[PDB]
Design a protein around this ligand. Sequence first.
Ligand SMILES: O=C(NCCCN(CCCCN(CCCNC(=O)c1cccc(=O)n1O)C(=O)c1cccc(=O)n1O)C(=O)c1cccc(=O)n1O)c1cccc(=O)n1O
Ligand SMILES: [Cl-]
Ligand SMILES: [Sm+3]
Length: 177
Amino acid sequence: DSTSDLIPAPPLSKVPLQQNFQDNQFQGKWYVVGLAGNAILREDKDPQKMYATIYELKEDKSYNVTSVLFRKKKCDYWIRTFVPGSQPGEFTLGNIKSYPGLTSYLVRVVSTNYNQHAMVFFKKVSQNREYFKITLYGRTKELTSELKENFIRFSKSLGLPENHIVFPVPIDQCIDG
Ligand SMILES: O=C(NCCCN(CCCCN(CCCNC(=O)c1cccc(=O)n1O)C(=O)c1cccc(=O)n1O)C(=O)c1cccc(=O)n1O)c1cccc(=O)n1O
Ligand SMILES: [Cl-]
Ligand SMILES: [Sm+3]
């Protein structure tokens, strides 16, 4: 039982796809340097900590995707599969049936230069609620003001105000491995 009110997901036509996406070059570790979405809310109290996400390309060209978070004084590891979707750089979540309430989960790589930064769009329908976010990934924990301004501009183009954009605080626990 619940009530919630969400900013509507944008149409996919507003979400670019990285041209000539290179699945091998996207592999390895990325830090989550920025997050924006309709369930992201900037909170001065308990600021969001940076986490890292590792993409490994499998034989069948799916990704094993592992996020590492520091929570309650320990490293917490979330492992899932991204299955290639309708075009290069687009994916859906593998094994959707295994996640209660989940009916769709879409990933689109918007832009990346592979060796410094990426922006990736996610849309999920869970218990019939449509959540979306944009993740700004960096190969390092810092990115330029330019890249952050680009991220903010892109987020706003998808109907997100500034208070639904956060920049997780760099940490050293867990994510330096
Ligand atoms: O709105 C979104 N995110 C902002 C709020 C995140 N959050 C607060 C943080 C929670 C902490 N965890 C989750 C870590 C564990 N994860 C999961 O066992 C998981 C299983 C199945 C689907 C799924 O999505 N998750 O996360 C992250 O920090 C984390 C890290 C890396 C990737 C990732 O996805 N998450 O969440 C939520 O509780 C939340 C609310 C609504 C939808 C949703 O998916 N999540 O995770 C969102 C929109 C569209 C796709 C999507 O995956 N997300 O998370
Ligand atoms: Cl992630
Ligand atoms: Sm999630």
